[PDB]
Amino acid sequence: AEFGNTKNNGASGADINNYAGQIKSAIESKFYDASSYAGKTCTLRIKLAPDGMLLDIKPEGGDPALCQAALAAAKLAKIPKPPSQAVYEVFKNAPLDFKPHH
């Protein structure tokens, strides 16, 4: 439980990046620590509607295998409804790269 403001955060960037990261970690629990490769990149052209669903999803990354599998794993991941307006304003058009997760 890292909270929404532990000291002076909520607009530093890493807070929003953490919400992007929550999807990254979710993807591993849909493959294994198999998703935990290395030396790869999987830029995904995604668009999350306010209802918490990806209307757009296109692999534009650098690894065709990682990206091909990522499409299915990400759809099986748990992504909540965008709450905070700042996060929502980004999530509605946040094409994120999904590479080997920590």
Short mmCIF file of C-alpha atoms in Angstrom, two decimals:
data_model
loop_
_atom_site.label_atom_id
_atom_site.label_comp_id
_atom_site.label_asym_id
_atom_site.label_seq_id
_atom_site.Cartn_x
_atom_site.Cartn_y
_atom_site.Cartn_z
CA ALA A 1 0.00 0.00 0.00
CA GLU A 2 1.92 2.97 -1.35
CA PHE A 3 -1.03 5.38 -1.07
CA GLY A 4 -1.87 8.27 -3.37
CA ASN A 5 0.35 10.65 -1.44
CA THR A 6 2.93 9.22 0.93
CA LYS A 7 4.89 12.46 1.27
CA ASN A 8 4.64 14.82 -1.69
CA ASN A 9 3.57 12.88 -4.76
CA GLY A 10 0.58 12.58 -7.04
CA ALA A 11 2.01 14.73 -9.82
CA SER A 12 5.68 13.78 -10.01
CA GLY A 13 5.25 11.44 -12.96
CA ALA A 14 6.33 8.19 -11.34
CA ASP A 15 2.87 8.14 -9.78
CA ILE A 16 1.23 7.97 -13.20
CA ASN A 17 4.00 5.65 -14.40
CA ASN A 18 3.06 3.38 -11.50
CA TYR A 19 -0.48 3.11 -12.88
CA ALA A 20 1.08 2.11 -16.18
CA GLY A 21 3.29 -0.29 -14.28
CA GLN A 22 0.31 -2.01 -12.64
CA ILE A 23 -0.63 -3.26 -16.10
CA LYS A 24 2.95 -4.37 -16.72
CA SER A 25 3.00 -6.55 -13.58
CA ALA A 26 -0.49 -7.88 -14.35
CA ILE A 27 0.79 -9.28 -17.65
CA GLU A 28 3.33 -11.54 -15.93
CA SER A 29 0.63 -13.33 -13.95
CA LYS A 30 -0.89 -14.28 -17.31
CA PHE A 31 2.22 -15.99 -18.66
CA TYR A 32 4.68 -16.68 -15.84
CA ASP A 33 8.02 -15.16 -15.09
CA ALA A 34 8.17 -16.03 -18.74
CA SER A 35 7.17 -12.51 -19.63
CA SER A 36 10.31 -11.61 -17.70
CA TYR A 37 12.65 -11.82 -20.69
CA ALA A 38 15.23 -9.14 -21.57
CA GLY A 39 16.68 -7.13 -24.43
CA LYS A 40 13.27 -6.63 -26.03
CA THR A 41 10.72 -3.87 -26.55
CA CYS A 42 6.99 -4.04 -27.20
CA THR A 43 5.46 -0.65 -27.86
CA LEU A 44 1.69 -1.06 -27.94
CA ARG A 45 -0.60 1.51 -29.52
CA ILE A 46 -3.37 1.30 -26.94
CA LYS A 47 -6.33 3.49 -26.06
CA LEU A 48 -8.24 2.93 -22.84
CA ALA A 49 -11.83 4.12 -22.76
CA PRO A 50 -13.16 5.76 -19.53
CA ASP A 51 -14.86 2.42 -18.88
CA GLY A 52 -11.50 0.72 -18.49
CA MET A 53 -11.20 -1.09 -21.80
CA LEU A 54 -8.69 -0.96 -24.64
CA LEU A 55 -10.47 0.05 -27.84
CA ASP A 56 -7.19 0.23 -29.71
CA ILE A 57 -4.36 -2.28 -29.44
CA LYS A 58 -1.57 -2.53 -32.00
CA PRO A 59 1.99 -3.91 -31.68
CA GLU A 60 4.46 -1.28 -32.91
CA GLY A 61 7.34 -2.40 -30.77
CA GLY A 62 10.61 -4.09 -31.69
CA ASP A 63 9.91 -7.71 -30.81
CA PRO A 64 7.19 -9.43 -32.88
CA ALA A 65 7.02 -12.43 -30.54
CA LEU A 66 6.82 -10.50 -27.27
CA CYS A 67 4.25 -8.16 -28.79
CA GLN A 68 2.17 -10.95 -30.33
CA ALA A 69 1.84 -12.65 -26.95
CA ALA A 70 1.47 -9.35 -25.08
CA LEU A 71 -1.79 -8.59 -26.90
CA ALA A 72 -3.44 -11.67 -25.40
CA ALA A 73 -1.82 -11.43 -21.97
CA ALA A 74 -2.68 -7.74 -21.56
CA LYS A 75 -6.32 -8.41 -22.44
CA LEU A 76 -6.38 -11.08 -19.74
CA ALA A 77 -4.82 -8.66 -17.24
CA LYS A 78 -6.72 -6.69 -14.62
CA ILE A 79 -7.12 -3.04 -15.60
CA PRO A 80 -9.48 -0.89 -13.46
CA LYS A 81 -11.68 2.04 -14.43
CA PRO A 82 -9.59 5.27 -14.70
CA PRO A 83 -10.32 7.27 -11.51
CA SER A 84 -8.09 10.32 -11.08
CA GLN A 85 -8.63 12.88 -13.84
CA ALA A 86 -4.87 13.16 -14.41
CA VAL A 87 -4.52 9.42 -14.92
CA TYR A 88 -7.75 9.27 -16.93
CA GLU A 89 -6.59 12.13 -19.17
CA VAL A 90 -3.55 10.04 -20.03
CA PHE A 91 -5.09 6.56 -20.06
CA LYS A 92 -7.61 7.57 -22.73
CA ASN A 93 -4.62 7.70 -25.09
CA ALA A 94 -1.59 6.13 -23.46
CA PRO A 95 0.37 3.94 -25.89
CA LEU A 96 2.72 2.16 -23.53
CA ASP A 97 5.64 -0.12 -24.21
CA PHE A 98 5.53 -3.50 -22.52
CA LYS A 99 8.98 -4.97 -22.15
CA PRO A 100 10.39 -7.51 -19.58
CA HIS A 101 8.78 -6.53 -16.30
CA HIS A 102 10.43 -6.33 -12.89
#
